[PDB]
Design a protein around this nucleic acid. Structure first.
Ligand SMILES: [Zn+2]
Lengths: 330, 97, 48, 417, 83
RNA sequence: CACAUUCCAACCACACCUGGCGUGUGGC
């Protein structure tokens, strides 16, 4: 009976994680699905269980449209003179009352839809409370590994997914370690995992600097350009707003003190820390650095840039896979 | 042997027991009572009657009904002894061998 | 087929494996009779 | 090749070392599998290994040697020990042991202990000549553990007020009573720093039960001492496990005539854990705590005492109050009159961002006459009489100002005349 | 396997040799718990383990402890067929 | 130092049931 409904709403474990209002909304959906499965005809029904004053009372939704298929839920947009509508849309009736909500199939569908709704609500809640920290480095142990994606736990049943594109090709995972990344995507409507954390994207590098470099975070050394090759090489152009600070001794550190740390965090990724410049020439010279550039050709109609490197420094300006150029193109 | 003695948990607190169990229990009871009476220096006639009762119990366990008084354990029916589990059309030879 | 506590299982395992051959063993009820006679004041014993 | 030599260095050194040793990519494995595979491949070259770790008794009879890298938990690199060694050399929980070890032999999966060389920093020959814990005669604290640095740094005030509010001694029983976000962490860090500086002879250990990982990683590199912790990443089974581990380590060390000082944070988390791992006994009171759910916290706390033959066990745990749930309160309730020394921090003082926020007269130490001298005790009484009529907050500010003018407390005492 | 069967009288020493214990209590089992008595008509240390490879006190229930008796009840952990 | 075992990705082991005995009735 309704006493059983109150006992159910009071005997939940996650009481505030899914409050009485949304509990009774899920129960309304349960009873609506039950009444739908009762009659062979399809009819939308609202319940309004009356959380604290009274019991439930089913109704009959019309879904006012000019169609006639299954007229149990069909009524024209002009039927408003008798039965006291007086509307254009939204005209619903309260004809059928006092259905049964405790038999076998009703209990089964109720339990099923309640499980579904509570798990969905708790997943969406534990993801949404972390959504405010989008674009930050977070800790947390991984849960399970697979050939397509991995799972991470941020504490208090916080499920996060990391897809294969977010993982590095030779990134190493084992249930037990704390793989740290940056939250980048949230989809609170996803049927499954929706907390997306990445480490292959350049923004993580910024966040990496945000947890390592004290210069960044105060907007004194702005991170302007960033291109990546997972596990191979990251080309970053960071500008200096002041004059007495050199990124080769500030962003790089003291003889590879910061660049080495972010490389080990990224799993051995070469990090070319150069200076951003308002001139495309110096920008592309710093992009292919270190090298010896003796040419510059610019074309704004085709947006192309030709750099004839010196004879012999090919492996110094192109190298493996042309990364020194490809990342520059990126 | 214990499992060779029929004793199965019936429906409820009651157990389906064998007729040999009652015999062995009565034998043990009278033996313990006799051992107690021998320590308290009971009168000669009392220990005589106790020995007679223990003899009755052990011969009933051996072959009930042969002494002349077929004692019953339940349902006012003759009890099943060790000799009864061998003789007749219900012993081991006629039924289980 | 009836009494061998360790023969019927062996026979079933042989038959399901396509082996139509038996093992004598010893009937359990015979050991039961041996114990029952032994429970009396009578000693029954198997020789060599 | 020792176990600790790979136990303490960071993961990066392990990476370069295994990459040098010509390994499968070790970056795919856990720290414990890293050390396991490296020790495997080292023994595959023909070296006899040495190792160390704290023993844990299992109910099947055999024991397992854990490290502080796993926070004393089950891992692939745990060293198996037979029950017969536990018999002959008289081993038990808490006995830290170092000696000859080998990788698991053919078909096994855990290291084996060959030859015992050090039992609780002692010869294994005298390890059988030990005194038990419950047979000890406890006492009050007589030796003073001075917490003042004397250098007069800015944060050192939070230590000097210690010597002015609640004295500490070897084997003291201290309870920190404070609401959340009042300044318990910085207080505990200063306590650990001052103890490790002024008393480097006594072993210093800290308990972090259901804490944040950032606090753990900041603690493990701020204090000069081996720390153990357990965040909320793990079930309460891990918390109770590390609880027996640390308490038995302290017990065996004090049995070896050593002074142990444990800083536990927080006892409320530990009580929640003990309550949630204990089965229901049908005895429920307000808050949702079982009646026997508190026997384990009572045991862990009553483990503190001052031994007469030598050594002592000081246990200083922090409790949480004003957390909105009555259950926590009930915990603090049974821990109200159990301790003989308390540090009461009121949120009313911490709300003004004036640190340290310590309630003076609500704090105190029982039988503190045996910890300090006569001059110091008289000056403490005079200071208490001066601070009593005034309130909490600006009176604490008054103490902070009077402490900041002088360099050490000798000048403060002389000025108070 | 074996030759002819021999039957004769049972000497008291022969009975004691056959005996793996002595039943003293006239009780068989308990009402609440269905476990057998200590040394009644249905005993464990006298006849054998009621369950397969599991002692009466539950201390030695694994196959590794199979073959030995306990320290309190003293029941040789084996199959129940020994009963 | 020695005896002796080593508590956990599918799954192997953790299975399945009242003729104790009597009475009554019926059939061959
Ligand atoms: Zn047992």
């Amino acid at each position: 009976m309704n006493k059983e409904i109150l006992a159910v709403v009071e005997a939940v474990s996650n009481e505030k994680a899914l409050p009485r209002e949304k509990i009774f909304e899920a129960l309304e959906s349960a009873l609506a699905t039950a009444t739908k499965k009762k009659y062979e005809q399809e009819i939308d029904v609202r319940v309004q269980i009356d959380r604290k004053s009274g019991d439930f009372d089913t109704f009959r939704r019309w879904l006012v449209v000019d169609e006639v298929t299954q007229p149990t839920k069909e009524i024209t947009l002009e039927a408003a003179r008798y039965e006291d509508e007086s509307l254009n849309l939204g005209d619903y009736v309260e004809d059928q009352i006092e259905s049964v909500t405790f038999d076998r199939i009703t209990t089964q569908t109720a339990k099923q839809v309640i499980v579904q709704k509570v798990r969905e609500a708790e997943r969406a809640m534990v993801v949404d409370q972390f959504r405010e920290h989008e674009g930050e480095i977070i800790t947390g142990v991984v849960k399970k590994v697979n050939r397509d994606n991995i799972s991470l736990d941020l504490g208090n049943n916080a499920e996060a997914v990391i897809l294969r594109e977010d993982m590095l090709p030779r990134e190493n995972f084992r249930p037990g370690d704390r793989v740290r990344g940056v939250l980048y995507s949230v989809r609170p409507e996803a049927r499954g995992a929706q907390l997306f954390v990445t480490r292959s994207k350049p923004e993580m590098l910024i966040e990496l600097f945000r947890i390592e470099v004290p210069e960044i975070g105060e907007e004194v050394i702005e991170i302007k350009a960033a291109a990546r090759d997972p596990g191979s090489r990251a080309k970053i152009a960071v500008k200096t707003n002041d004059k007495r600070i050199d990124p080769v001794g500030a962003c790089v550190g003291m003889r590879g003190a910061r660049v080495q740390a972010v490389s080990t965090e990224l799993g051995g990724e070469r990090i070319d820390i150069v200076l951003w410049d308002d001139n495309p020439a110096q920008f592309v010279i710093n992009a292919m650095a270190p090298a010896d550039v003796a040419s510059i050709v610019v074309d704004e109609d085709k947006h192309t840039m030709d750099i004839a490197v010196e004879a012999g420094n090919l492996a110094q300006a192109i190298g493996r896979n042309g990364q020194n150029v490809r990342l520059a193109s990126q | 042997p214990p499992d060779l003695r029929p004793l199965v948990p019936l429906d409820g607190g009651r157990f389906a027991t064998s007729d040999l169990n009652d015999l062995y229990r009565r034998v043990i009871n009278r033996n313990n009572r006799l051992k107690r009476l021998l320590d308290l220096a009971a009168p000669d006639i009392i220990v005589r009657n106790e020995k007679r009762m223990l003899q009755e119990a052990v011969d009933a366990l051996l072959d009930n009904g042969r002494r002349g008084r077929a004692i019953t354990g339940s349902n006012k029916r003759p009890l099943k002894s060790l000799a009864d589990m061998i003789k007749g059309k219900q012993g081991r030879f006629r039924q289980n061998l | 087929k009836s009494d061998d506590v360790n023969g019927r299982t062996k026979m079933y395992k042989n038959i399901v494996d396509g082996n139509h051959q038996m093992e004598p063993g010893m009937p359990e009820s015979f050991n039961v009779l041996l114990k029952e006679i032994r429970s009396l004041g009578i000693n029954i014993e198997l020789e060599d | 090749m020792n176990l600790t030599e790979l136990k303490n260095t960071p993961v990066s050194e392990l990476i370069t070392l295994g990459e040098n040793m010509g390994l499968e990519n070790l970056a795919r494995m856990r720290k414990q599998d890293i050390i396991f595979a490296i020790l495997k491949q080292h023994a595959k070259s023909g070296e006899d290994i040495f190792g160390d770790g704290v023993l844990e008794i299992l109910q099947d009879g055999f024991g397992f040697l854990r490290s502080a890298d796993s926070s004393y938990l089950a891992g692939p690199d745990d060293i198996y020990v037979s029950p017969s060694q536990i018999r002959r050399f008289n081993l038990r929980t808490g006995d830290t042991i170092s000696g000859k070890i080998r990788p698991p032999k053919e078909g096994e999966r855990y290291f084996a202990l060959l030859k015992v060389n050090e039992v609780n920093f002692d010869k294994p020959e005298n390890a059988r000549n030990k005194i038990l814990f419950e047979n000890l005669t406890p006492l009050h604290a007589n030796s003073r553990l001075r917490m003042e640095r004397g250098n007069g740094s800015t944060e050192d005030l939070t230590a000097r007020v210690l010597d002015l509010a609640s004295p500490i001694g070897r084997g003291q029983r201290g309870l920190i009573v404070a609401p959340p976000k009042a300044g318990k962490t910085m207080l505990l860090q200063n306590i650990a720093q001052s103890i490790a500086y002024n008393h480097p002879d006594c072993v210093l250990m800290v308990l972090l039960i259901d804490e944040r990982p950032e606090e753990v990683t900041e603690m493990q590199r701020l204090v000069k001492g081996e720390v153990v912790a357990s965040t909320f990443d793990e079930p309460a089974s891990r918390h109770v496990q590390v609880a027996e581990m640390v308490i038995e380590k302290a017990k065996r060390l004090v049995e070896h005539k050593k002074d142990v000082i444990i800083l536990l944070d927080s006892i409320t988390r530990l009580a929640r854990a003990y309550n949630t791992v204990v089965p229901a006994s049908g005895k429920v009171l307000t808050g949702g705590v079982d009646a026997n759910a508190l026997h384990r916290p009572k045991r862990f706390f009553g483990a503190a005492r001052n031994v007469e033959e030598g050594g002592s066990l000081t246990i200083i745990a922090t409790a949480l109050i004003d957390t909105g749930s009555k259950m926590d309160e009930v915990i603090y309730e049974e821990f109200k009159g159990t301790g003989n020394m308390e540090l009461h921090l009121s949120r009313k003082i911490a709300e003004k961002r004036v640190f340290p926020a310590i309630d003076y007269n609500r704090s105190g130490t029982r039988k503190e006459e045996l910890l300090t001298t006569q001059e110091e005790l008289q000056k403490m009484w005079i200071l208490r009489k001066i601070i009593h009529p005034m309130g909490e907050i600006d009176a604490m500010e008054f103490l902070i100002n009077k402490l900041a003018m002088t360099k050490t407390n000798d000048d403060f005492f002389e000025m108070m005349k | 396997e074996f030759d002819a069967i021999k039957i004769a009288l049972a000497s008291p020493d022969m009975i004691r040799s056959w005996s793996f214990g002595e039943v003293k209590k006239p009780e068989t089992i308990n009402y609440r718990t269905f476990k057998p008595e200590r040394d009644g008509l249905f005993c464990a240390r006298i006849f054998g383990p009621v369950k397969d490879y599991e002692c009466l006190c539950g201390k030695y229930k694994r196959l590794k402890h199979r073959g030995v008796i306990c320290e309190k009840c003293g029941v040789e952990v084996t199959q129940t067929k020994v009963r």
